[PDB]
Design a protein around this nucleic acid. Structure first.
Lengths: 100, 55, 88, 271, 51
RNA sequence: AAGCUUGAGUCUCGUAGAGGGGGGUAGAAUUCCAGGUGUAGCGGUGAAAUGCGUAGAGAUCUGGAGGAAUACCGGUGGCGAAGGCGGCCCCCUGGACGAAGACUGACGCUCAGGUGCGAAAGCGUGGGGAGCAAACAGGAUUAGAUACCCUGGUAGUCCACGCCGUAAACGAUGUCGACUUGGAGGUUGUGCCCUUGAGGCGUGGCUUCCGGAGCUAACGCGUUAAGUCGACCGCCUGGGGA
RNA sequence: GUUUAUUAAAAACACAGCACUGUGCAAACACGAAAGUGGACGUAUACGGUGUGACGCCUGCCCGGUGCCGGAAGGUUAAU
């Protein structure tokens, strides 16, 4: 398996739907043989380039150790509600587990 | 180094107009200047910096 | 190069007769175990324009070991070309 | 696949066919078969209404279930078959209840693989999941121009059609005709693609090879007498007029669309 | 640090010294090795300050 | 015939970049789609038309969409056999390079024929047309202007691809082997350092630019040789005409 | 292949191929006092039409006339 940060911007107004979306996404990724290292979301976060016409985002991170055979098939889970774009999996650049 | 997407660092290597500063005004070796340019270009694809300050 | 979990499955098969496993019988069996990997590879995305150059590098490496073995021992040669997917 | 014939014996030289070994050829499922009677290019009012028609070799019709009456039923694709009636070919659907229907042959040509129906179905190809549940950017085929009206719009061979945009309780798609069209999104479509796509590469090669296909030769308007077509023969190389159909319509540039009922569904033309 | 002003602005401020075309990027490229070989006559750096 | 381990190939370990392959994807400007704010200009030349234009052209803006090329970085840069290849992400994937040991035990080098590979333009089967534009039109400049300017515009460029083998395919260096003199500079392995360094020094690969011997008529080549010297395969012996 | 049954048997017509074009589906188009049909149990690689004539070389100019495509300011102008 390989390490992936899997961090997506999310529309800033979805900040209280995020806990249910990340439940729905994590409920597919453990059967896909992924191990969770760090699972985070911020809110009140900003951009310098607009996405969905906004300079504002929530940010959601699902940093995992996962099979390389399912990392584009991951899109089938993002299309399972189709409310989020660009998973940005980011293969092996940095890693933190829980907080360390 | 230590998670490259640090916009406070990347803003120290660009002009007021957002242009990449030439290696001679930072004393930077070309080995690092090309990787710093890659980091600044990637930061546009992270939405942390505009592609031009004009937009 | 081939992994220690895979080389050990081939050396026990092409190195039965003698304790020293240095024969080109083993060297071409270990090569076929890596040509199997670069031949597939192809599918997914069977079409190619450069990676098959590494396959035609293995063609020479295969042809050389067979010429060397045919010069070495006619019995160990004729027995080997019947135990692999060689010459159609 | 596509094949040319060898120039051995006179007349074979130019003949090009479409061929496919991945698709079956034989007799149709008899409960979905009828002979489908000819009109002869004539109607109940005793006159010709069609041209280039008559004769041909023996042919029946394979009944495709374009207008559907129920939802929710699990199925499997039992056959992938050739169909002389359509360029898109045909596939046999077997529902768990012991019921069979025909559909247009999907681009993947795969048999013995399950498909689900209704709004509970997974967001997967070939499922009977209507456009209100599907992501924008998906491929649909036989897109159902108006809901409940069944399979029409973009159903001939090589079609896929992609959903381009959302417009509230509607979705908009793009056509190879240069048209971009809005639909009421309760439309089912085939949630996938259709096969063949090689049918424009065919070359008939012979002057008789349309005759066994129910086609009859049709004389040029300026070669027949002036009493039957507004052209009318001369006098060598005469013409001296603006070119028209046998019924006076100018053959080029002159437009004939006159519907004016549903313009609000058409977003762009000649795109 | 030539322009640096954002928001309100007056007069020209286009014509500056140092960086872009001489001192010490762009122009003079026909001199080639004059950009490296003269060392301490044309190059201050050396580390310990601003690389 | 038989050794020998040095050539060669195999192996232990890994990295940067436009090397290759399959998919996912985005914006400026532009055009189309659908519309507003507003009025004689637009655009451009030494000077000016045509054209778009009051029927609202240009300017400006909201919503949507297409396609090429992927600005800056970008050049004392990388990767590569040549042509070349850049844009962001993922999966697959070729080739290079080094130290202490391991393995075969001359297994190697080159190579008539043989099998392979285009920057472009073109053609062929089928698509596609925003940007640009041969051809051709309109208007100018002028002796004329078959050119530049300027209003348009087909083929082509793009793509699924196929054929060809085209060129300044010119960084003019066929492929292998080996000996020799210094410096300024960068990168990548690999091994060290009495590391008071904000680093230093050995030793391989790549590698820019000067420079000593020697060779050439001369430029210069200059340890990555045009010096020195073995192995293999092609080419040369006036031009016009070819 | 087709033909003027008894003066023409063909280079004409048809025809593989081609361009240009109409047609978004209750298609365009055709029949016709108008329904209901035919197009089609087809749906843009589907259907209509014109001419030229398979295959290889290919295929320029003139928008004045007339028609078609498109455009709406200004003027002529009927019923009312």
């Amino acid at each position: 398996m390989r390490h992936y940060e899997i961090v997506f911007m999310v529309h800033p107004d979805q900040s209280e739907q995020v806990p249910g979306m990340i439940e729905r996404y994590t409920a597919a990724i453990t059967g896909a043989e992924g191990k969770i290292h760090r699972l985070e979301d911020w809110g009140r976060r900003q951009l310098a380039y607009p996405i969905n016409k906004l300079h504002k985002a929530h940010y959601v991170l699902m940093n995992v150790e996962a099979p390389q055979e399912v990392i584009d098939e991951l899109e089938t889970t993002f299309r399972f509600n189709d409310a989020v774009i660009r998973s940005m999996v980011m293969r092996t650049k940095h890693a933190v587990t829980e907080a360390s | 180094e230590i998670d490259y997407k640090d916009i406070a660092t990347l803003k120290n290597y660009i002009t007021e107009s957002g242009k990449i500063v030439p290696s001679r005004i930072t004393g930077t070796r070309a080995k690092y200047q090309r990787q710093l340019a890659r980091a600044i270009k990637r930061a546009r694809y992270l939405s942390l910096l505009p592609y031009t300050d004009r937009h | 190069s081939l992994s220690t979990e895979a080389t050990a499955k081939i050396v026990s098969e092409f190195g039965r007769d003698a304790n020293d496993t240095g024969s080109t019988e083993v060297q071409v069996a270990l090569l076929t175990a890596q040509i199997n990997h670069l031949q597939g590879h192809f599918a997914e995305h069977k079409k190619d324009h450069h990676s098959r150059r590494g396959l035609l590098r293995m063609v020479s490496q295969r042809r050389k070991l067979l010429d060397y073995l045919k010069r070495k021992d006619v019995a160990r040669y004729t027995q080997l070309i019947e135990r692999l997917g060689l010459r159609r | 696949a596509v094949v040319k014939c060898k120039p051995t014996s006179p007349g074979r030289r130019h003949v090009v066919k479409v061929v496919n070994p991945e698709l079956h050829k034989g007799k149709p499922f008899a409960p979905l078969l009828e002979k489908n009677s000819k009109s002869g290019g004539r109607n109940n009012n005793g006159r010709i209404t069609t041209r280039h028609i008559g004769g041909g070799h023996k042919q029946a019709y394979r009944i495709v279930d374009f207008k559907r009456n129920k939802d929710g039923i699990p199925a499997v694709v039992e056959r992938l078959e050739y169909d002389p009636n359509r360029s898109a070919n045909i596939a046999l659907v077997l529902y768990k209840d012991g019921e069979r229907r025909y559909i247009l042959a999907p681009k993947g040509l795969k048999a013995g693989d399950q498909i689900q129906s209704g709004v509970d179905a997974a967001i997967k190809p070939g499922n009977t999941l209507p456009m209100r549940n599907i992501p924008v950017g998906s491929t649909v085929h036989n897109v159902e121009m108006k809901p409940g009206k069944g399979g029409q719009l973009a159903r001939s061979a090589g079609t896929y059609v992609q959903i381009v945009a959302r417009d509230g309780a509607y979705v908009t798609l793009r056509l190879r005709s240069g048209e971009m069209r809005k639909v009421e999104a309760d439309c089912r479509a085939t949630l996938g693609e259709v096969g063949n796509a090689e049918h424009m590469l065919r070359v008939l090669g012979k002057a008789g090879a349309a005759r066994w296909r129910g086609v009859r030769p049709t004389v040029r308007g300026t070669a027949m007498n002036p009493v039957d077509h507004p052209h009318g023969g001369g006098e060598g190389r005469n013409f001296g007029k603006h070119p028209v159909t046998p019924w006076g319509v100018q053959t080029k540039g002159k437009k004939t669309r006159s519907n004016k009922r549903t313009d609000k569904f058409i977003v762009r033309r000649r795109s | 640090i030539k322009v640096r002003e954002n928001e309100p602005f007056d007069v020209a401020l286009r014509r500056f010294k140092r960086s872009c075309e001489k001192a010490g990027v762009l122009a003079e490229v026909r001199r080639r090795e004059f950009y490296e070989k003269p060392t301490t006559e044309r190059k201050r750096a050396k580390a310990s300050a601003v690389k």
